Amino acid sequence: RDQAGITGTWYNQLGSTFIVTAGADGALTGTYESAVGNAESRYVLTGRYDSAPATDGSGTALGWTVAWKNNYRNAHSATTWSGQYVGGAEARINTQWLLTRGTTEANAWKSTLVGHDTFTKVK
Amino acid sequence: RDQAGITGTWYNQLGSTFIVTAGADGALTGTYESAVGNAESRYVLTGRYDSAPATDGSGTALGWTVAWKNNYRNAHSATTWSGQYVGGAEARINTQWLLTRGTTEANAWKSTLVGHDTFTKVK
Amino acid sequence: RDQAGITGTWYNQLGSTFIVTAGADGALTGTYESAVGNAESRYVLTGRYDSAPATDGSGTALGWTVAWKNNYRNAHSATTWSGQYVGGAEARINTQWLLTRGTTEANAWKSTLVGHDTFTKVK
Amino acid sequence: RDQAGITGTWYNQLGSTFIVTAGADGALTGTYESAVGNAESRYVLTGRYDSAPATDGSGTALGWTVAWKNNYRNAHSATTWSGQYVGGAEARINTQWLLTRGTTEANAWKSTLVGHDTFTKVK
User: Fold this and answer.
1) Domains of chain D by range and CATH?
2) In chain D, fewer beta carbons within 10 Å around the N or the C end?
3) Which positions in chain C touch A114 (Cβ < 8 Å)?
4) In this structure, are residues B103 and A76 in contact, taking their beta carbons and an 8 Å threshold?
5) What distances in angstroms separate CA B103 from CA A11, A62, A121, B75, D123, one per listed residue?
6) Whose CA is closest to A45, among A13, A24, A21, A16?
């Protein structure tokens, strides 16, 4: 339903760039570029979305992962964004995210950051 | 480094089954079967992991997504697990997860569940 | 430093009302009224804030708890807001929150909702 | 119902010490000592719990806050624990927590850590 809705270039409140293709099978594939956190250039992302969402005005559930390793840098970390795509005049992806850093057992308690990103089709 | 470490069948504290292959390129591919939450049978998952982790005793950062749609059911939801793989005698994947349900704007505030799953190679 | 900054009436993006007094000792005391989630009227809250924040332009760390029981209703739940107070022209409290419902062991996995509320001094 | 159940000394998986009194009015008051994160000695905590929980075998919802300032140190941060008290043979408090550090706007995205602590009456 939202394959075309989701496919494209999205920007969050930080100036990060999320380039995604939604597959007819529920796949999400693309690249993430973070404006913050010592990331450089594009990182692979993959994820999933609900390819057959409720017809009742509900958002479309989705998430995706970026491991912060590319040819430029390795943060030894990974972020997952869990959220929903909201169609219409000003389409949004509203997300919450978990970033886990690889740590020792002794630092495991502080391994994970949590936040929220809102993505729009205009910067 | 942990491609073989991660590839395989993992079980969490709920009796859920996570079947994953780690690609040399950082890919995670496989299937998830939840013991809870009105899921039935296998659901596609995709994700990423740090294919070149720190050599310093740190875990390996990873995450993955499941959209809760297969041929049996559609929960109109998606879970992301963010965590780290810890190698050795009793290998673990320690995760935190966000489950977002597709909702109306009026219910968006209650769209997202958070928990923690610990995966082991024995049930 | 921010005792006066924090003391007052705040509104979030949902139209909820947070009435708080910051004590010189780091205490937060007051009442919360939720615009959503079948809450009615005021609920007691308590919390803490950093009464001696960094002088470097950083926010002031704080959190507080509401148990969703008053003389009108009992949701058998509790929310904690963790965030920071940002002073200046448009003062904000930026929070992330965890709502845990009392559950059986069998439903514990779905006990906890997560979100984010941003509070302003104007509605 | 669980006033006596909750009142006491609890330990988490990190060796931290949570000393709490549950008030008949839903209050939680006491002190927290963290085994990790450069905390030293006791810090004030306050919170709330459901003083009239469901009679149906459900846990009792609660949370509390610690601002990481005492006479010894100031981390410029605050943790909230949201969870539920589970009575019986081996009483537990199962929590999820958010730690927000005071930050600049530019670092706000990385302000918040998330984890999970399980508290028992024996160390």
Assistant:
1) 3-120 (2.40.128.30)
2) C
3) 96, 114
4) no
5) 22, 12, 20, 12, 42
6) A21
